[PDB]
């Protein structure tokens, strides 16, 4: 069937899916630019482009 | 909206407008001739032309 899977596979499936979690966010962040606020909803915030 | 100003900006712009009062006086006062004025209110006096 396609809609249904073996209940006693699941942790197998799980433990490949938190695998995949940790591989995809492997990165470093980046400084992009900013920019001050015109408007009076922040007190003069700096805010991220 | 092109009518209006931010209120944020005042001191800004006002601070330059003085700076303008300022820079378009800078000038010396140049001599020329003078008449003798015989109107009977002011009798004497010798008035810059």
């Known amino acids: 069937?396609?809609?249904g899977a073996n209940p006693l596979m699941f942790r197998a499936n799980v433990l490949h899916m938190?695998?995949?979690?940790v591989l995809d966010n492997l990165y470093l962040n980046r400084h992009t630019g900013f920019s001050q606020d015109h408007t009076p909803f922040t007190e003069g915030?700096?805010?991220?482009?």
């Open 45 to 49: 915030a700096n805010l991220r482009s």
């Open 1 to 3: 069937s396609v809609r």
């Open 18 to 21: 938190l695998l995949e979690f």
